[PDB]
Coordinates of C-alpha atoms and ligand atoms in Angstrom, one line a residue:
Chain A
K8 CA -50.0 28.1 10.9
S9 CA -47.6 30.5 10.6
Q10 CA -45.1 30.8 7.8
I11 CA -41.3 30.9 7.7
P12 CA -39.9 34.6 8.7
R13 CA -38.9 36.8 5.6
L14 CA -35.8 39.1 6.2
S15 CA -34.0 41.6 4.2
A16 CA -30.0 40.9 3.8
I17 CA -29.8 44.4 3.2
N18 CA -32.1 46.0 6.0
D19 CA -33.3 43.3 8.7
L20 CA -29.4 41.9 9.2
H21 CA -29.3 42.3 12.8
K22 CA -32.8 40.4 13.1
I23 CA -32.0 37.6 11.4
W24 CA -30.2 35.4 14.0
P25 CA -32.6 36.2 16.5
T26 CA -35.6 35.3 14.2
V27 CA -33.8 31.9 13.6
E28 CA -32.9 31.2 17.4
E29 CA -36.9 32.0 18.3
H30 CA -38.6 30.1 15.3
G31 CA -35.7 27.6 14.0
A32 CA -36.1 29.0 10.5
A33 CA -35.9 32.2 8.6
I34 CA -35.8 33.1 4.6
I35 CA -33.1 35.7 4.1
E36 CA -34.2 37.3 0.7
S37 CA -31.4 38.0 -1.9
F38 CA -28.8 36.6 0.3
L39 CA -26.9 36.2 -2.8
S40 CA -27.3 38.7 -5.8
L41 CA -28.5 37.1 -9.2
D42 CA -25.0 37.8 -10.7
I43 CA -23.2 35.6 -7.9
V44 CA -25.8 32.8 -8.4
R45 CA -25.5 33.3 -12.2
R46 CA -21.5 32.7 -11.6
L47 CA -21.7 29.8 -9.3
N48 CA -24.2 28.0 -11.6
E49 CA -21.8 28.4 -14.3
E50 CA -18.8 27.2 -12.7
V51 CA -20.3 24.4 -10.7
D52 CA -22.1 23.1 -14.0
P53 CA -19.8 20.6 -15.2
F54 CA -18.6 19.3 -11.8
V55 CA -22.6 18.6 -11.0
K56 CA -22.9 16.8 -14.7
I57 CA -19.8 14.7 -13.9
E58 CA -20.8 13.5 -10.4
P59 CA -21.5 10.2 -9.7
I60 CA -24.5 8.9 -7.3
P61 CA -23.9 9.5 -3.9
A62 CA -23.0 5.9 -3.0
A63 CA -21.3 5.3 -6.1
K64 CA -19.0 1.8 -5.9
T65 CA -15.6 3.9 -6.9
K66 CA -16.0 6.0 -3.6
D67 CA -14.6 4.9 -0.5
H68 CA -17.0 7.5 1.7
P69 CA -20.3 6.4 -0.2
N70 CA -23.2 8.5 0.6
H71 CA -25.9 5.7 1.2
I72 CA -28.7 8.4 2.5
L73 CA -29.2 10.5 -0.4
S74 CA -31.5 9.6 -3.1
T75 CA -29.8 8.4 -6.4
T76 CA -31.2 11.0 -8.3
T77 CA -29.2 13.5 -6.1
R78 CA -25.9 15.0 -7.1
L79 CA -23.9 16.6 -4.4
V80 CA -20.4 18.5 -5.2
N81 CA -18.4 19.7 -2.1
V82 CA -14.7 21.3 -1.7
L83 CA -16.1 24.3 -4.0
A84 CA -13.1 26.7 -3.6
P85 CA -11.1 25.2 -6.4
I86 CA -14.2 25.1 -8.4
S87 CA -15.7 28.3 -8.1
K88 CA -14.2 31.7 -7.9
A89 CA -17.4 33.1 -6.9
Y90 CA -17.8 30.7 -3.8
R91 CA -14.5 31.3 -2.8
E92 CA -14.3 35.0 -3.1
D93 CA -18.1 36.5 -2.7
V94 CA -19.5 33.6 -0.7
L95 CA -17.0 32.8 1.8
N96 CA -16.6 36.8 2.5
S97 CA -20.4 37.5 2.5
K98 CA -20.8 40.3 5.1
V99 CA -24.3 38.9 5.9
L100 CA -23.2 35.3 6.4
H101 CA -20.0 36.8 8.6
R102 CA -22.7 38.8 11.0
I103 CA -25.1 35.8 11.4
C104 CA -22.5 33.4 12.2
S105 CA -20.6 35.6 14.6
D106 CA -24.1 36.3 16.5
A107 CA -24.8 32.5 16.3
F108 CA -21.3 31.4 17.6
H109 CA -20.1 33.9 20.0
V110 CA -20.7 31.8 23.2
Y111 CA -18.3 29.2 21.3
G112 CA -15.5 31.2 19.4
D113 CA -14.6 30.9 16.0
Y114 CA -16.4 29.3 13.2
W115 CA -15.8 27.7 9.9
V116 CA -17.3 25.8 6.7
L117 CA -18.4 22.3 7.8
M118 CA -19.7 21.9 4.3
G119 CA -20.2 23.8 1.1
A120 CA -21.9 22.0 -1.4
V121 CA -24.1 22.4 -4.5
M122 CA -26.9 19.7 -4.5
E123 CA -28.9 19.2 -8.0
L124 CA -32.1 17.0 -7.3
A125 CA -33.3 15.8 -10.5
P126 CA -37.0 15.7 -11.6
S127 CA -39.2 13.2 -9.7
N128 CA -36.7 13.1 -6.7
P129 CA -38.6 12.2 -3.7
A130 CA -39.1 13.9 -0.5
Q131 CA -36.7 13.3 2.3
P132 CA -37.7 12.2 5.7
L133 CA -37.9 14.8 8.1
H134 CA -34.6 14.8 9.9
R135 CA -32.1 16.9 11.8
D136 CA -28.8 17.2 10.0
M137 CA -25.4 16.2 11.3
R138 CA -26.6 12.8 12.8
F139 CA -24.7 10.8 10.1
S140 CA -21.4 12.6 10.7
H141 CA -21.4 14.0 14.2
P142 CA -22.9 11.5 16.8
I143 CA -21.6 14.2 19.4
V144 CA -24.1 16.7 18.6
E145 CA -27.0 14.3 20.2
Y146 CA -25.2 14.5 23.6
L147 CA -25.4 18.0 23.9
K148 CA -27.7 19.5 26.6
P149 CA -31.1 21.0 25.1
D150 CA -30.2 24.6 25.9
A151 CA -26.7 24.4 24.3
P152 CA -26.5 27.0 21.6
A153 CA -26.4 25.5 18.1
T154 CA -23.0 24.3 17.3
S155 CA -23.8 24.2 13.4
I156 CA -26.3 26.3 11.1
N157 CA -27.4 25.6 7.4
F158 CA -27.9 28.2 4.7
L159 CA -29.8 26.4 1.8
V160 CA -29.3 28.8 -0.7
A161 CA -31.8 28.5 -4.1
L162 CA -29.5 28.3 -7.1
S163 CA -33.1 27.9 -9.0
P164 CA -36.4 28.3 -7.9
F165 CA -38.0 26.4 -5.0
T166 CA -41.8 25.9 -5.5
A167 CA -44.2 23.7 -3.7
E168 CA -44.9 21.7 -6.5
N169 CA -41.0 21.3 -7.6
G170 CA -39.8 20.0 -4.0
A171 CA -39.1 23.4 -2.0
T172 CA -37.7 22.3 1.8
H173 CA -40.3 21.6 4.3
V174 CA -39.6 23.0 7.9
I175 CA -41.3 22.7 11.4
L176 CA -41.3 26.1 13.1
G177 CA -40.1 25.8 17.1
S178 CA -38.9 22.1 16.2
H179 CA -35.2 23.1 17.0
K180 CA -36.3 23.2 20.8
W181 CA -38.3 19.9 20.4
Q182 CA -37.1 17.2 23.2
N183 CA -40.1 14.8 22.5
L184 CA -40.3 13.7 18.9
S185 CA -44.0 12.3 19.2
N186 CA -45.6 15.0 17.1
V187 CA -43.3 15.0 14.3
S188 CA -45.2 14.8 11.0
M189 CA -45.6 16.6 7.6
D190 CA -49.0 18.0 9.0
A191 CA -46.8 20.4 11.2
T192 CA -44.3 21.6 8.2
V193 CA -44.2 24.8 6.3
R194 CA -42.4 25.4 3.1
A195 CA -39.4 27.5 1.9
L196 CA -40.7 29.3 -1.2
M197 CA -37.5 31.0 -2.6
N198 CA -36.4 32.8 -5.8
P199 CA -32.7 32.0 -6.9
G200 CA -30.3 33.9 -4.5
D201 CA -33.0 33.6 -1.4
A202 CA -31.7 31.5 1.5
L203 CA -33.6 29.3 4.1
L204 CA -31.2 29.4 7.2
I205 CA -32.0 26.5 9.8
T206 CA -30.0 25.5 12.9
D207 CA -28.8 21.7 13.3
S208 CA -32.1 21.2 15.3
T209 CA -34.4 22.4 13.1
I210 CA -36.6 19.4 11.6
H211 CA -36.7 19.6 7.9
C212 CA -36.6 17.8 4.8
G213 CA -36.2 18.3 0.9
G214 CA -40.0 18.3 -0.7
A215 CA -41.2 16.0 -3.3
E216 CA -40.4 17.0 -7.0
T217 CA -43.8 16.3 -8.8
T218 CA -43.5 17.7 -11.9
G219 CA -41.2 15.5 -13.6
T220 CA -39.5 18.2 -15.4
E221 CA -38.1 20.6 -13.1
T222 CA -34.4 20.3 -11.8
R223 CA -33.8 21.8 -8.5
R224 CA -30.5 23.1 -7.4
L225 CA -29.1 24.6 -4.1
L226 CA -26.2 25.7 -2.3
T227 CA -26.0 24.1 1.4
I228 CA -23.6 26.2 3.6
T229 CA -23.2 24.3 6.8
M230 CA -21.3 26.8 9.2
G231 CA -20.2 25.2 12.4
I232 CA -18.0 26.0 15.4
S233 CA -14.3 25.6 14.8
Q234 CA -14.4 22.9 17.7
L235 CA -16.4 20.8 15.3
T236 CA -14.5 18.7 12.3
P237 CA -15.7 19.7 8.8
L238 CA -17.5 17.1 6.7
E239 CA -15.1 18.1 3.8
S240 CA -11.5 18.4 3.4
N241 CA -9.7 21.4 1.8
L242 CA -6.0 19.8 2.2
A243 CA -5.7 18.8 -1.4
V244 CA -6.8 22.6 -2.7
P245 CA -3.7 24.1 -4.6
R246 CA -1.4 26.6 -2.6
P247 CA -2.0 29.2 -5.4
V248 CA -5.8 29.1 -4.7
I249 CA -5.6 29.0 -1.2
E250 CA -3.0 32.0 -1.4
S251 CA -5.5 34.1 -3.4
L252 CA -8.0 34.2 -0.8
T253 CA -8.7 36.3 1.9
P254 CA -7.3 35.6 5.4
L255 CA -11.1 35.0 6.5
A256 CA -11.8 32.7 3.5
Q257 CA -8.5 30.8 4.4
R258 CA -9.9 30.3 8.0
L259 CA -12.9 29.0 7.0
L260 CA -11.2 26.5 5.0
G261 CA -9.2 25.2 7.7
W262 CA -5.9 26.7 6.3
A263 CA -5.5 28.8 9.4
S264 CA -5.4 28.3 13.0
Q265 CA -8.6 29.0 15.2
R266 CA -9.9 30.3 18.2
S267 CA -12.5 29.4 21.2
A268 CA -14.3 32.1 23.3
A269 CA -12.6 30.8 26.5
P270 CA -11.1 34.0 28.2
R271 CA -7.6 32.9 28.2
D272 CA -8.1 30.6 25.0
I273 CA -5.2 28.2 23.8
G274 CA -6.4 27.7 20.4
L275 CA -7.2 25.2 17.8
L276 CA -4.7 23.7 15.4
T277 CA -1.8 25.5 16.6
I278 CA 2.0 24.8 16.0
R279 CA 4.0 25.2 19.3
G280 CA 2.3 28.5 20.2
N281 CA 2.1 30.0 16.7
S282 CA -0.4 29.8 14.1
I283 CA -0.5 27.8 10.5
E284 CA -0.4 30.8 8.8
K285 CA 2.6 32.4 10.5
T286 CA 4.6 29.1 10.7
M287 CA 4.1 28.1 6.9
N288 CA 4.3 32.0 5.9
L289 CA 0.8 31.7 4.2
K290 CA 0.2 34.5 1.7
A291 CA -3.4 36.1 1.3
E292 CA -5.2 37.9 -1.6
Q293 CA -2.3 37.3 -4.2
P294 CA -4.2 36.9 -7.7
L295 CA -3.8 33.6 -10.0
Chain B
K8 CA -8.7 6.9 50.8
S9 CA -7.9 4.4 48.0
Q10 CA -5.2 4.6 45.9
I11 CA -5.1 5.2 41.7
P12 CA -5.8 1.6 40.3
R13 CA -2.5 0.1 38.7
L14 CA -2.6 -1.8 35.6
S15 CA -0.3 -4.0 33.4
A16 CA -0.1 -3.1 29.7
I17 CA 1.1 -6.7 29.1
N18 CA -1.9 -8.4 31.2
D19 CA -4.5 -6.3 31.9
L20 CA -5.3 -4.6 28.6
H21 CA -9.0 -5.2 28.3
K22 CA -9.4 -4.1 32.1
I23 CA -7.8 -0.5 31.4
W24 CA -10.6 1.3 30.1
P25 CA -13.2 0.2 32.3
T26 CA -11.0 1.1 35.3
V27 CA -11.1 4.4 33.9
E28 CA -14.4 4.7 33.2
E29 CA -15.4 3.6 36.8
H30 CA -12.7 5.3 38.7
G31 CA -11.8 8.2 36.5
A32 CA -8.1 7.4 36.5
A33 CA -5.7 4.4 36.1
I34 CA -1.8 4.0 36.1
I35 CA -0.9 1.9 33.0
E36 CA 2.6 0.2 34.2
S37 CA 5.4 0.4 31.6
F38 CA 3.0 1.9 28.8
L39 CA 6.2 2.9 27.1
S40 CA 9.4 0.9 27.3
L41 CA 12.6 2.3 28.7
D42 CA 13.9 2.1 25.2
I43 CA 11.2 4.2 23.7
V44 CA 11.2 6.7 26.5
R45 CA 15.3 6.9 26.0
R46 CA 14.7 7.6 22.5
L47 CA 11.8 9.8 22.7
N48 CA 13.9 11.9 25.5
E49 CA 16.8 12.0 23.2
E50 CA 15.1 13.3 20.1
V51 CA 12.9 16.1 21.9
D52 CA 15.7 17.3 23.9
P53 CA 16.9 20.2 22.1
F54 CA 13.6 21.4 21.2
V55 CA 12.6 21.6 24.6
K56 CA 15.7 23.8 25.3
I57 CA 14.7 26.1 22.6
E58 CA 11.2 26.5 23.4
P59 CA 10.3 30.0 24.8
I60 CA 8.0 30.3 27.4
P61 CA 4.4 29.7 27.0
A62 CA 3.1 33.2 26.7
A63 CA 6.2 34.4 24.7
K64 CA 5.5 37.7 23.1
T65 CA 6.6 36.4 19.9
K66 CA 3.5 33.9 19.7
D67 CA 0.4 34.8 18.4
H68 CA -1.3 31.8 20.1
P69 CA 0.2 32.5 23.7
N70 CA -0.6 30.0 26.5
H71 CA -1.3 32.3 29.4
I72 CA -2.2 29.6 31.8
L73 CA 0.9 27.8 32.0
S74 CA 3.7 28.7 34.6
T75 CA 6.4 30.5 32.9
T76 CA 8.4 27.7 34.2
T77 CA 6.8 25.0 31.8
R78 CA 8.0 24.4 28.5
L79 CA 5.4 22.6 26.2
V80 CA 6.5 21.1 22.9
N81 CA 3.9 19.9 20.6
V82 CA 3.7 18.6 16.7
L83 CA 6.2 16.0 17.8
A84 CA 6.1 13.9 14.4
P85 CA 8.5 15.9 12.8
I86 CA 11.0 16.0 15.7
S87 CA 10.5 12.5 16.9
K88 CA 10.9 9.0 15.2
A89 CA 9.8 7.3 18.3
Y90 CA 6.8 9.4 18.7
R91 CA 5.6 8.9 15.3
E92 CA 6.7 5.2 14.8
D93 CA 6.3 3.7 18.3
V94 CA 3.8 5.6 20.1
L95 CA 1.4 6.7 17.3
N96 CA 1.4 2.8 16.7
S97 CA 1.0 1.7 20.3
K98 CA -1.3 -1.6 20.6
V99 CA -1.9 -0.5 24.0
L100 CA -3.0 3.1 23.2
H101 CA -5.1 1.8 20.3
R102 CA -7.1 -0.7 22.2
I103 CA -7.9 1.7 25.0
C104 CA -9.1 4.3 22.7
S105 CA -11.2 2.0 20.7
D106 CA -12.7 0.9 24.0
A107 CA -13.2 4.3 25.0
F108 CA -14.5 6.0 21.8
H109 CA -16.6 3.2 20.2
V110 CA -20.1 5.1 20.6
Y111 CA -18.8 7.9 18.7
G112 CA -16.4 6.4 16.0
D113 CA -12.8 7.2 14.8
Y114 CA -10.4 9.0 17.3
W115 CA -7.3 11.1 16.4
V116 CA -4.5 13.0 18.3
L117 CA -6.0 16.4 20.0
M118 CA -2.5 17.0 21.3
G119 CA 0.8 15.1 21.6
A120 CA 3.4 17.2 23.8
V121 CA 6.5 17.0 25.9
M122 CA 6.0 19.2 28.8
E123 CA 8.9 19.8 31.0
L124 CA 8.7 21.5 34.4
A125 CA 11.3 23.3 36.0
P126 CA 12.7 23.1 39.5
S127 CA 10.4 24.7 41.9
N128 CA 7.3 24.6 39.6
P129 CA 4.2 25.4 41.8
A130 CA 1.2 22.8 41.8
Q131 CA -1.2 23.7 39.1
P132 CA -4.9 24.5 40.4
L133 CA -7.3 21.6 40.3
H134 CA -9.1 21.5 36.7
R135 CA -10.4 19.4 34.0
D136 CA -8.8 19.8 30.7
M137 CA -10.2 21.1 27.5
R138 CA -11.6 24.2 28.9
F139 CA -9.4 26.7 27.1
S140 CA -10.0 25.1 23.9
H141 CA -13.1 23.4 23.6
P142 CA -15.9 25.2 25.1
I143 CA -18.6 22.7 23.8
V144 CA -17.5 20.0 25.9
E145 CA -18.7 21.9 29.0
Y146 CA -22.4 21.7 27.0
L147 CA -22.3 17.9 26.8
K148 CA -24.8 15.8 29.0
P149 CA -23.5 14.2 32.3
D150 CA -23.8 10.5 30.9
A151 CA -22.2 11.5 27.4
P152 CA -19.5 9.1 27.1
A153 CA -15.8 11.0 27.5
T154 CA -15.3 12.8 24.0
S155 CA -11.4 12.9 25.1
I156 CA -8.6 11.0 27.3
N157 CA -5.3 12.3 28.3
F158 CA -2.4 9.5 28.7
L159 CA 0.4 11.5 31.0
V160 CA 3.3 9.2 30.3
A161 CA 6.2 9.8 32.8
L162 CA 9.5 10.5 30.8
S163 CA 11.3 11.1 34.3
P164 CA 10.2 9.9 37.7
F165 CA 7.0 11.1 39.1
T166 CA 7.4 11.6 43.0
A167 CA 5.4 13.2 45.8
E168 CA 8.5 15.4 46.3
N169 CA 9.0 16.6 42.8
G170 CA 5.4 17.4 41.7
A171 CA 3.8 14.0 40.7
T172 CA 0.2 14.7 39.1
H173 CA -3.0 14.7 41.7
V174 CA -6.2 13.3 40.9
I175 CA -9.7 13.1 42.6
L176 CA -10.9 9.6 42.0
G177 CA -14.7 9.4 40.8
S178 CA -14.4 13.3 39.9
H179 CA -15.3 12.4 36.4
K180 CA -19.2 11.8 37.4
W181 CA -19.2 14.8 39.6
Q182 CA -21.7 17.6 38.5
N183 CA -21.6 19.6 41.9
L184 CA -18.1 21.1 42.6
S185 CA -18.3 22.1 46.0
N186 CA -16.0 19.5 47.5
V187 CA -13.2 20.2 45.1
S188 CA -10.4 20.0 47.5
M189 CA -6.4 18.9 47.5
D190 CA -7.8 17.2 50.5
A191 CA -9.6 14.8 48.3
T192 CA -6.5 13.7 45.6
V193 CA -4.2 10.8 45.4
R194 CA -1.0 11.0 43.9
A195 CA 0.3 9.3 40.3
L196 CA 3.6 8.0 41.7
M197 CA 5.1 6.7 38.6
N198 CA 8.4 5.3 37.0
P199 CA 9.5 6.6 33.4
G200 CA 7.4 4.7 31.1
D201 CA 4.4 4.3 33.3
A202 CA 1.2 6.4 32.2
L203 CA -1.5 8.1 34.2
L204 CA -4.7 7.9 32.1
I205 CA -7.6 10.4 32.9
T206 CA -10.7 11.5 31.0
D207 CA -11.6 14.8 30.2
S208 CA -13.9 15.1 33.2
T209 CA -11.4 13.9 35.8
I210 CA -10.5 16.7 38.0
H211 CA -6.7 16.7 38.4
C212 CA -3.5 18.9 38.6
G213 CA 0.1 18.7 38.2
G214 CA 2.0 18.9 41.7
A215 CA 4.4 21.2 43.5
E216 CA 8.3 20.8 42.6
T217 CA 9.5 21.1 46.4
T218 CA 13.1 19.9 46.0
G219 CA 14.4 23.0 43.7
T220 CA 16.6 20.5 42.1
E221 CA 14.6 18.2 39.8
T222 CA 13.1 18.7 36.5
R223 CA 10.1 16.4 35.6
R224 CA 9.1 15.6 32.1
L225 CA 6.1 13.9 30.5
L226 CA 4.7 13.1 27.3
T227 CA 0.7 14.1 27.2
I228 CA -1.1 12.4 24.6
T229 CA -4.8 13.8 24.6
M230 CA -6.8 11.4 22.2
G231 CA -10.2 12.5 21.2
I232 CA -13.1 11.7 18.8
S233 CA -12.5 12.9 15.3
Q234 CA -15.5 15.0 15.5
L235 CA -13.5 17.5 17.7
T236 CA -10.8 19.9 16.4
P237 CA -7.3 19.0 17.6
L238 CA -5.3 21.6 19.7
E239 CA -2.3 21.1 17.1
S240 CA -2.0 21.2 13.5
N241 CA 0.1 18.9 11.1
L242 CA -0.4 20.8 8.2
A243 CA 3.1 22.1 7.9
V244 CA 4.6 18.4 8.4
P245 CA 6.6 17.6 5.6
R246 CA 5.2 15.2 3.2
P247 CA 8.0 12.8 3.2
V248 CA 7.7 12.3 7.0
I249 CA 3.9 11.9 6.6
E250 CA 4.5 9.2 3.8
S251 CA 6.9 7.4 6.1
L252 CA 4.1 6.9 8.7
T253 CA 1.6 3.6 8.9
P254 CA -2.0 4.4 7.6
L255 CA -3.2 4.5 11.3
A256 CA -0.5 7.4 12.0
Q257 CA -1.4 9.4 9.2
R258 CA -5.0 9.3 10.3
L259 CA -4.2 10.3 13.8
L260 CA -2.4 13.3 12.5
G261 CA -5.4 14.5 10.3
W262 CA -3.7 13.4 6.9
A263 CA -6.3 11.0 6.3
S264 CA -10.5 11.1 6.3
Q265 CA -12.5 10.0 9.3
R266 CA -15.5 8.2 10.3
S267 CA -18.0 8.6 12.6
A268 CA -19.9 5.4 14.2
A269 CA -23.5 6.3 12.7
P270 CA -24.7 3.3 11.0
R271 CA -24.7 4.8 7.6
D272 CA -21.8 7.1 8.5
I273 CA -21.0 9.9 5.5
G274 CA -17.6 10.6 6.9
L275 CA -15.3 13.7 8.0
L276 CA -12.6 15.6 6.1
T277 CA -14.0 13.8 2.7
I278 CA -13.7 15.2 -1.0
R279 CA -16.6 14.6 -3.0
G280 CA -17.4 11.2 -1.4
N281 CA -13.9 10.1 -1.6
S282 CA -11.1 9.9 1.1
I283 CA -8.0 12.5 1.6
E284 CA -5.7 9.6 1.3
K285 CA -7.2 8.3 -2.1
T286 CA -7.7 11.7 -3.7
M287 CA -3.9 13.0 -2.7
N288 CA -2.7 9.5 -3.4
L289 CA -0.8 9.4 -0.1
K290 CA 2.0 6.8 0.2
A291 CA 2.3 5.1 3.4
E292 CA 5.3 3.4 5.4
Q293 CA 8.0 4.8 2.4
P294 CA 11.2 5.1 4.6
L295 CA 13.0 8.4 4.6
Ligands
58D301 C1 -32.8 11.2 2.0 O1 -33.0 11.7 3.3 C2 -32.2 12.4 4.1 C3 -31.9 12.2 5.6 C4 -31.4 13.1 6.2 C5 -30.2 13.8 5.6 C6 -29.2 14.4 6.4 C7 -28.1 14.9 5.9 C8 -27.1 15.6 6.7 O2 -27.0 15.3 7.4 N1 -26.3 16.5 6.3 C9 -26.1 16.9 4.9 C10 -26.0 18.3 4.9 C11 -26.1 18.9 3.9 C12 -26.1 18.3 2.7 C13 -26.2 17.0 2.6 C14 -26.5 16.3 4.0 C15 -26.7 14.7 3.8 O3 -25.8 14.1 3.0 N2 -27.3 14.2 4.6 C16 -27.3 12.5 4.7 C17 -30.3 13.9 4.2 C18 -31.3 13.1 3.5
58D302 C1 -1.3 26.2 35.6 O1 -2.8 25.7 35.7 C2 -3.1 24.9 35.0 C3 -4.7 24.8 34.5 C4 -5.2 24.5 33.7 C5 -5.0 23.6 32.7 C6 -5.6 23.0 31.7 C7 -4.9 22.8 30.2 C8 -5.9 22.2 29.1 O2 -6.8 22.2 29.2 N1 -5.1 21.3 28.3 C9 -3.8 21.0 28.3 C10 -3.5 19.6 28.0 C11 -2.3 18.9 27.9 C12 -1.1 20.1 28.2 C13 -1.5 21.2 28.5 C14 -2.5 21.8 28.6 C15 -3.1 23.0 28.8 O3 -2.1 23.7 28.1 N2 -3.9 23.6 29.5 C16 -4.2 25.0 29.8 C17 -3.3 23.7 32.6 C18 -2.7 24.4 33.8
CL303 CL1 -34.2 21.0 0.2
CL304 CL1 1.2 16.3 35.7
NI305 NI1 -31.4 18.4 5.9
NI306 NI1 -4.6 19.0 33.0

């Protein structure tokens, strides 16, 4: 069985989305530089350490799906300069997203999260993303272009023994799911900064951590059309932080109006014919 | 040909959504009281008068579809006490919406707008709503439950001669649109406070104003699943105004997290497992 296609962020940029459209997955080698990975890790480190269990009794939106040995930290913009500057303005990410979502229009971040898997973390069941948040997605026609995609960026090594992600190539086109099995999977073996890109229809799962010693960390960036509601809110992010961002980063975090691809688009999140950013006089690229 | 079913807001409440599901339209008699209509009208009056043309060159999200003799005012919460208190907490609206959207989960306001049509306003072409903002909707399967519905509330009389809305009954189930014609329509003749309820698949249009003297006004409330992005933003609505609302009204305006109907729902617009309202310590029902 064939392995996940591996592509250069530098050289093969136009090939990335077409590869994912055909095969359901691709590995983007050095999607983030080692420097960006270093800074991201350093900045999110304490927030991962203080994060409670996914279904903590203190939470009013507990995640009952993730293993108790998973820590997920989202709303990364206030935590991480590297995320809000380097990642949110990634040339590679934006080329891929504009390739993927041109039929629909603007896209934004549905969720940007750091996930840390503890040693001995079990494999997840094979799944498609979005089914615990967006029931609408299951009602889309088979040939509907993907309305979200997920960049699974390695922040530490992904190996077969420490639980590297499994994917079933071609499974994004499957209607009948009788042949869903771990027998059909291949692995996303990745160095820090490499990213596995999948669609919302790609069948996949986190792998089993079998060493009992290694802690695997990733940055999962679910990008989706601006017509779908994000899993996370940036409403509470301080205005100085938002005003330090590029206009593009502001749009990605829901601090701007959005546009569809309809020929005479009337827009999303508008205010009496004007944008959020025009109405609120929102500044951009103002240093803290 | 059969007329639009007419139902009591008081007596026939459980019958309203089933009627719309079957026929694609229903008239809810006295959906709003005359007092609520009076107050709504008085409060929005000046904002309608100052509103420029839909495609005004000053706007960065111009509406190129609406006639130049239409004035549309959205983001009504800061304008109208009657809207944000009486309409957003309407028992009838919420019963209908929970009936309609139970398969998907929470719902919210995609757009609440007052539309005023000037004398001699031409009939709109027959259409389905949502096609200039949510291209995703066209890619839903035929049997997908409606993901949005539109309450067209009369704020002045709707008569055949002054441009009362046309609908084609049953057209919400149409796949082939070869028989789309004004020959197939019936009219929504309505007194102030009556509402025509349609789905996002009901084929309909505003009628021709033929008197040259009458100004027709309506309140259009597009309610949709919380998984779809609103056409309008309440991000710039002052916090004192938001904190005067009920928790339900806050949710409807995007000042709360949202939930899907998935058995182990992980939520929408959350912040590290907690809600917007918990995170921001958002007060409710605090008088101005
Ligand atoms: C333990 O087995 C699992 C089964 C299904 C899922 C799906 C997933 C999702 O739909 N979206 C995301 C996307 C990014 C990060 C986390 C999640 C997330 O929480 N779930 C539930 C996760 C785990
Ligand atoms: C002039 O002919 C027309 C053709 C189509 C439409 C559709 C409509 C929409 O999709 N949504 C709404 C919903 C509530 C109020 C206004 C609108 C709105 O602006 N358009 C464009 C309007 C007019
Ligand atoms: Cl994984
Ligand atoms: Cl109308
Ligand atoms: Ni997944
Ligand atoms: Ni319409």
